[PDB]
C-alpha cells in the first residue's frame, strides 16, 4: 500500500516566521571578482532577485574578516 494518512494541527499558529523567512546571501568573496560591477548590474539578475522580495540579502562569508574599506579607492 502506497496510501498515507496525514494528521494536521490547525488550532493555532505554532510559529510566526518573518515575511523575509526565505532570504539569500552574496558571498563577500564576490566583491574580489573583477566583474563584480557587471554582475550585480545585470537587469536579468535584478528581475530574479525581485522575485524573492521580500527578503534579506546578507553580504558576508569567510572574506568578511579579510576585507578593508578604502574610501580612497575608485
Amino acid at each position: 500500500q502506497d496510501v498515507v494518512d496525514l494528521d494536521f494541527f490547525t488550532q493555532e499558529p505554532l510559529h510566526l516566521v518573518s515575511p523575509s523567512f526565505l532570504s539569500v546571501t552574496i558571498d563577500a568573496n564576490l566583491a574580489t571578482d573583477p566583474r563584480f560591477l557587471i554582475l550585480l548590474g545585470s537587469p536579468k539578475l535584478r528581475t530574479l532577485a525581485r522575485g524573492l522580495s521580500p527578503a534579506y540579502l546578507r553580504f558576508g562569508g569567510t572574506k568578511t574578516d579579510f576585507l578593508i574599506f578604502d574610501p580612497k579607492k575608485e
Binding site: D2, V3, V4, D5, L6, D7, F8, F9, T10, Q11, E12, L14, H15, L16, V17, S18, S20, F21, L22, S23, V24, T25, I26, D27, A28, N29, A31, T32, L37, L40, S42, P43, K44, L45, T47, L48, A49, R50, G51, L52, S53, P54, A55, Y56, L57, R58, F59, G60, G61, T62, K63, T64, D65, F66, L67, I68, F69, D70, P71, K73
Partner: protein, 383 residues
C-alpha cells in the same frame, strides 16, 4: 588574505539590494584588532560614515564564523570578547544615523563545529545588543558529497538535532531572542558539483525550510543567490536553477503562520510533510486557506489522504519534477509538466496550478516535491 573595496563596490551592492526590493545586511571585518585584541572600529567608522552620506538603509553583522578565526588567521577571539566587540559596534550605530538599524550575530558554525561554548559566552556577553542570533548550517562536505547523500532522510534528519542544540544554548542565555540561519546550504566548500545546482538540491532546501519554520527559526539565508559556488540559486549565465524556482514557488504559496502535518505511518522518514497558512498576499487564495508541502524520497508514487474535515476540499497542486534527460541531476524543472523559464530578461512566468478533482488523494511521484493549497479550508488560526 586582506583586500580592500571601494565606495563603488558599496554603491553596486546597495543598488542591487535597493532596486531588487531586498534588505541589505553587511558583514563588518571582526579581525581588525587592537594590541589588546579589542575590536578596532576605525575602518567600520569610515564605512558607516560613507553609507551615512549616501542615505543608505543597511543592517549589520560583525565577523563570520568566529569559531574558525584561529584556523583562518591564527587569532583566537573568545565569545566573551566578541560579545564586548558587538557592544562597541552597537554604541557606534547608536551614535550614528544608523541608530534604528539592526545588528545580528555572531554567525557561528553549526554545533558539529563545537561552537556551543563560543555561542553561549557570546550571548552572555553581547546578547543584549543583537536583534537575532545567527548561525550557519551545511549538511555535507562539497568535495565528498554523493547523489545518495542528497536523497538520504538520515542526512536530512541530522538538521533537527543541530537546531535543538542551538536552541538549548539560546534558551539558557537569551530566552525568546529570535534565531536566524544566517548562512546555509547543501554542502560546504562551495557546494557539490552537479548536485548543489540541480533538482537534487531541492530535497535538502525544501526540508530545511520546512524544519526551520516548524522549529522556530524566523529567517533562513540561502548561500548563495549568485556566485562561484555550485549552491548558487542562479548560475554564471544568469539562468535560474531548480532551487531558484522552488524558492519562488515557496514565496508565492507559503504564509508566515506555521502549522504542523505528520504522516500516520510509524516510520521511513521518506515522506516529509509541512503545513502553513497560505500566503494571503497571493490573490488566488483567501483567509483560512492551507498550504501543505511534501517531499517524497520513496522510489514509488505515494498518495496522501487529507484528514477530516479537509478531505472533500478543492486542492491546487504545484508539483516540481526535473526536465530530462538528466533526471535528478537536471538543471531544468517543470511545474505540473510545464518547463519553468523566464519569459524574457524582465519577466518571470506565471506559476500555473493544477486543480485536483475534489476528494482525490494527493499523488506525489517518487523523488519529487509538491505544494498543495487546500482551498476554502476556513482555518480560523489562518484568519
Amino acid at each position: 588574505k586582506n583586500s580592500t573595496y571601494s565606495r563603488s563596490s558599496v554603491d553596486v551592492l546597495y543598488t542591487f539590494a535597493n532596486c531588487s526590493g531586498l534588505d541589505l545586511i553587511f558583514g563588518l571585518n571582526a579581525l581588525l584588532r587592537t594590541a589588546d585584541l579589542q575590536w578596532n572600529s576605525s575602518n567600520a567608522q569610515l564605512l558607516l560614515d560613507y553609507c551615512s552620506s549616501k542615505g543608505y538603509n543597511i543592517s549589520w553583522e560583525l565577523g563570520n564564523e568566529p569559531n574558525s578565526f584561529l584556523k583562518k588567521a591564527d587569532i583566537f577571539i573568545n565569545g566573551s570578547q566578541l560579545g564586548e566587540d558587538f557592544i562597541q559596534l552597537h554604541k557606534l550605530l547608536r551614535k550614528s544615523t544608523f541608530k534604528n538599524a539592526k545588528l545580528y550575530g555572531p554567525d557561528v558554525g553549526q554545533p558539529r563545529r563545537k561552537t556551543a561554548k563560543m555561542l553561549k559566552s557570546f550571548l552572555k556577553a553581547g546578547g543584549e545588543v543583537i536583534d537575532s542570533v545567527t548561525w550557519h548550517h551545511y549538511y555535507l562536505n562539497g568535495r565528498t558529497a554523493t547523489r545518495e547523500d542528497f536523497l538520504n532522510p538520515d542526512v536530512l534528519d541530522i538538521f533537527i538535532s543541530s537546531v535543538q542544540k542551538v536552541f538549548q544554548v539560546v534558551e539558557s542565555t537569551r530566552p525568546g531572542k529570535k534565531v536566524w540561519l544566517g548562512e546555509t546550504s547543501s554542502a560546504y566548500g562551495g557546494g557539490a558539483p552537479l548536485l548543489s545546482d540541480t533538482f537534487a538540491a531541492g530535497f535538502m532546501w525544501l526540508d530545511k525550510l520546512g524544519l526551520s519554520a516548524r522549529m522556530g527559526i524566523e529567517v533562513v539565508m540561502r548561500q548563495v543567490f549568485f556566485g562561484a559556488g555550485n549552491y548558487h540559486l542562479v548560475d554564471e549565465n544568469f539562468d535560474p536553477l531548480p532551487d531558484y524556482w522552488l524558492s519562488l514557488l515557496f514565496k508565492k504559496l507559503v504564509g508566515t503562520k506555521v502549522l504542523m502535518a505528520s504522516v500516520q505511518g510509524s516510520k521511513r522518514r521518506k515522506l516529509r510533510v509541512y503545513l502553513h497558512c497560505t500566503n494571503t498576499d497571493n490573490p488566488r487564495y483567501k483567509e483560512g486557506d492551507l498550504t501543505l508541502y511534501a517531499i517524497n524520497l520513496h522510489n514509488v508514487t505515494k498518495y496522501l489522504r487529507l484528514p477530516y474535515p479537509f478531505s472533500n476540499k478543492q486542492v491546487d497542486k504545484y508539483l516540481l519534477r526535473p526536465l530530462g534527460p538528466h533526471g535528478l541531476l537536471s538543471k531544468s524543472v517543470q511545474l505540473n509538466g510545464l518547463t519553468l523559464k523566464m519569459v524574457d530578461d524582465q519577466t518571470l512566468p506565471p506559476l500555473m496550478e493544477k486543480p485536483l478533482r475534489p476528494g482525490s488523494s494527493l499523488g506525489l511521484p517518487a523523488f519529487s516535491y509538491s505544494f498543495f493549497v487546500i482551498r476554502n479550508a476556513k482555518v480560523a488560526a489562518c484568519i
